[PDB]
Amino acid sequence: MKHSLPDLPYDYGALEPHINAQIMQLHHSKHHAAYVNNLNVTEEKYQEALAKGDVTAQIALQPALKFNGGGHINHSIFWTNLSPNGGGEPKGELLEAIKRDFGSFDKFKEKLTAASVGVQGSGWGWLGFNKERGHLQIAACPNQDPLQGTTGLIPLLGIDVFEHAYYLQYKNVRPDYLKAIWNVINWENVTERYMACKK
Amino acid sequence: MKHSLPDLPYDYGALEPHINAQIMQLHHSKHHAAYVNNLNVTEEKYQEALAKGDVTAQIALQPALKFNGGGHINHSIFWTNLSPNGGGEPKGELLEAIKRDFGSFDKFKEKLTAASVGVQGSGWGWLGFNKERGHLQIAACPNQDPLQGTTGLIPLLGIDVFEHAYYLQYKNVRPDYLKAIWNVINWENVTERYMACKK
Amino acid sequence: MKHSLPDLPYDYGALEPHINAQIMQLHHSKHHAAYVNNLNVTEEKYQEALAKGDVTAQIALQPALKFNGGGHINHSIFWTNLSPNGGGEPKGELLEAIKRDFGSFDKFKEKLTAASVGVQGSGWGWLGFNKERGHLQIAACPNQDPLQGTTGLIPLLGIDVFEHAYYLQYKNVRPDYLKAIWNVINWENVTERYMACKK
Amino acid sequence: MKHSLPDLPYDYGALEPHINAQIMQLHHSKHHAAYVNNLNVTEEKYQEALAKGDVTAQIALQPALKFNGGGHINHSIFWTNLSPNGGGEPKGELLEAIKRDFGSFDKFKEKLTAASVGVQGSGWGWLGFNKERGHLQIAACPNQDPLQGTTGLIPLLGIDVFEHAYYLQYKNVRPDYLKAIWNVINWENVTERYMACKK
Ligand SMILES: [Mn+2]
Ligand SMILES: [Mn+2]
Ligand SMILES: [Mn+2]
Ligand SMILES: [Mn+2]
């Protein structure tokens, strides 16, 4: 059993003019391909260390596992979080939760934009579900540290703010990218992930 | 007394084809300009917090101070570490120290390349001087964490591996950028910084 | 501007048998005294560094400033959070908020206990108020990182889980210390801090 | 694969008066026992997670694996680094290396003392061997982060500066513990570890 690079669920150019085809093609076919590959290498190294009881080797592998494993986790969610069919606002129970927990949809967007723009260096902004509290929650995570693994929050919507996610098109102006990405958020998918959290 | 953006000591296109003019112009006129400005804002906020004894506010300012202050420190060194007159190998006492501490110049390049490529997320690779030990030392630093402030090592040569340092030209292939940058290292400047360490 | 060691609101033995007198005496007159003395020294070095535009020195001083500054913040709150007259349950709107946000007083105790017992190495567990969400929130902080300065949450109740907070009495058994400290929680103070957070 | 708590090379009181019997007994039979028990439990969860390709669980387990795994690594070395027959100075090639790399035995002691006293929060000071540079090197590590797993340096001599390593005897005065522990350094073991690092 090995991890595999999921195909992108749309054409490389499908999110233009919000995120261009050169970015989507590099982001998926180079960056994500490399996370999956490095993750499988690291998992096998870890299995050997575990079989040997080599704790030094397990701990030495931790940064590569978190970075590439987190990369695999985060980008697998990210591709489904975007869509040419996206944009606009969610409906039904996700919308009501957003209004209840953040005041309004636009207040929510301000909070997730602020968490995303606020990342210094590489990282991600997330809308998550706090299972213990039974409500929504915003967090930012450094580098590829994944949401559920490092906070327990269930990921609903992630925004990649590594410079490779935007730089070719938006250069240093990360806020321009955040403004554009709202046009391609796949609220159908974020709703699916939210409803899976509730029972 | 305020910090100021140092002019680049050469034309934006001067390091082509190793680092292109679009990168140098954004890197200096957008990214470094923003570090200096945010650093001065943060220093003034810190002075007010200090005058008030507001320790919460001092600690809340720490990430912006380290990121933008480190950014100012690191990029101020970086521009002088590059030159259209660069490339090749150092001479005299710096060369002898490199051979003594790392075996050879090429062994040194391998070690600094490995530290630079090994940064996961944003960061820097450094050749530094360990004043206590009286010899050279390689370290990598995360995000804009500056060498001397976080390790005590005196900076001689830094390699920026934030994606903005290379992505427009080299895309995901960070090793291609590291290979190119050796052609523009200003060994005259690294020698000046080294000789200043010795007395 | 000159921070001072606050007088304790009771004598060192007032929280016995739950926290013994020797711990309280060492905790206040040695550990907290050192946070204050070290904070003042570090603040003076920061004034000198700001005056000189020495950003390296500012950043080098950060770990000591957060550790001792955070120590001053945290322990100043901690003393007021405990009382010989404490224990039992809170009343009124705080009790209502606890039932609403954590399900019950007992479940809140389990959650703050688990966050405090869960710190690996030195740190703190906090009950805090989230100003933006208008509700209570539990978080853990590493070392002396203070809650408001690093998370924006307003501190209501803190539990020190540095080993010096419990070791002389409870040795390695941090869960016995957590069980005992509920007997001396100054809910009157936590209620004051909570009511201050609302208009 | 089943890690075990190593028997101590001496009885719990053998390092008195420098480290008293109660500390040694708690340190080995409670703290180290817990690192081993927690490491084994965490390793079993990692085997389950690897078998399922559950990367979230792998990453969630990392803090416990490094803390308890690192605890196992560090404390297993620590016990062998101390002896009732210890103290004094090393001989031969280790003494030569110490004089060469740190100037003198006394200056080496000051440097390892300063690194150990300098840890804010929990951690370790290490004398290590740098395989690539072919010389000795001092470093500090936070919490239980182990030296070789996080730095590649080979451990020669470790000093535990978690508060449980000294508090019952020395209370807050970590410098008195550092002065006392030189009396029980097992230089025969440190010499064996050093000679193993060379061909
Ligand atoms: Mn990405
Ligand atoms: Mn840069
Ligand atoms: Mn304390
Ligand atoms: Mn220990």
Author numbering:
A (entry chain A), B (entry chain A), C (entry chain B), D (entry chain B): 0 to 198
What do the paper's sentences say?
Human manganese superoxide dismutase (MnSOD) is a crucial oxidoreductase that maintains the vitality of mitochondria by converting superoxide (O2●−) to molecular oxygen (O2) and hydrogen peroxide (H2O2) with proton-coupled electron transfers (PCETs). Human MnSOD has evolved to be highly product inhibited to limit the formation of H2O2, a freely diffusible oxidant and signaling molecule. The Mn ion is bound by inner-sphere residues His26, His74, His163, Asp159, and a solvent molecule denoted as WAT1. The hydrogen bond network extends from WAT1 to outer-sphere residues Gln143, Tyr34, another solvent molecule denoted as WAT2, His30, and Tyr166 from the neighboring subunit.
